[PDB]
Design a protein around this ligand. Structure first.
Ligand SMILES: [Co+2]
Ligand code: NA
Ligand code: NA
Lengths: 136, 139, 136, 139
């Protein structure tokens, strides 16, 4: 149970580590801009409360879906279709980003070079010495 | 602001590069096809206003859903059952394409480029030293 | 456009390459067993046509959702809840499997060994010869 | 049948091993919590039959949906807006955990185990040959 708490503590730091990745934040910014963007629309087009809007906008981007309201106006169906698409666009972005070791490979390189350098320089001297010896 | 301004470019370029990927285009097409191919079926067999049939098609694929209309005809239900499977299929493929963070082919063979060099080099010196030692260990 | 056709041809082979992975097929088998499993249930419990069943079963596992019917009986809500969970269980399985190079690393090993072996054996002879020489 | 019989074991063991992973358990708990924590809110503030409030909670998180009931109160709507974000958050985490095919730590360091050996060996011979050559190239 100390286990539970200690783990959760690490995980929560990992989010914050991501939450300072520029790209992740662009996505969050885009999500929110798109979120209030829809609120602006369904509010002041499809005629709906500035909270009944946010509810449809969220229920739709996340693909849950309201069991009652849908776009009435044919204009409000066009938007919803293309909106939904920005949804997918976004959820694609995250899945890509949530699926990225690059640093472990840097150390391997930092050590393999230092090694391979010495291997070379050792071999070099050996050859240079076996040369000067097998003459004089 | 140093970052929010710039990264966007790189970000939009990053997925712009992904359009140039062919496998993505096929998935994006099979999408557009299945989608307008659905608008055809729902505008006729289930018989809905062109634009409305598109709406239902989108919503259904993206599993968003609609709290009002559902199929009536048994052909309209069997079709839908198969139509969601296609969406499953598509998204599976999309996920596969997106979940593999493969900038690693070019790294692991760009390693091998520099590696294979070193290997012939080391081996050459190993063979030289063996040949000169051989000759001196007789004379 | 020959491009289009030629690519699609490769992709479609890739599915078939997967469709002979044992694990993938277990998932498909499980999906289908679960699919008719629900059909059996909503048909002969919640009282629904043996096609109106398959439609609710599919619309629910895939998370679309019917806009009209939902489980009436409190028993049919219990199942649906836990069913939904087998859904997630499954869609987790696939995402894991759709996200797996193992063979490229085998060749690297097959070559690195043959190399490293020779490097060793070369170095070995050199030492053995420099030994017998610096005596007699 | 050679395969269908056996693999299941390995498959069920494979995810059985994943329960033993701690990070998964937290995600699985935050799940159970958020879920029964939702049944609490919808059984009161939105006021529904215990079991029914669970149903709505599940359905909503898993974005399945329900074509009938939706929130009425503004507290019941704001809550839901935040409740789906948690689902997003959770699933994001689940995906991250599941999408990384990391049996590669144990491989890349099991390489390094055998690699580091070879490296000291080669270096030792390199140093011996350099020392014996040094002594013989004076006497
Ligand atoms: Co000599
Ligand atoms: Na969904
Ligand atoms: Na839905």
């Amino acid at each position: 149970m100390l286990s539970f708490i200690l783990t959760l503590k690490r995980m929560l730091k990992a989010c914050l580590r991501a939450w300072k990745d520029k790209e992740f934040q662009v996505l969050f910014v885009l999500t929110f801009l798109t979120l209030t963007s829809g609120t602006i629309f369904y509010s002041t087009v499809e005629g709906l409360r500035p909270l009944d809007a946010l509810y449809f906008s969220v229920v739709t981007l996340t693909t849950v879906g309201d069991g009652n309201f849908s776009p009435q106006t044919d204009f409000g169906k066009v938007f919803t279709i293309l909106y939904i698409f920005i949804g997918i666009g976004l959820v694609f972005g995250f899945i890509h980003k949530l699926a990225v070791l690059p640093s472990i490979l840097s150390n391997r390189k930092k050590e393999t070079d230092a090694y391979r350098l010495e291997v070379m320089e050792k071999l070099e001297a050996i050859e240079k010495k076996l040369a000067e010896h097998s003459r004089q």
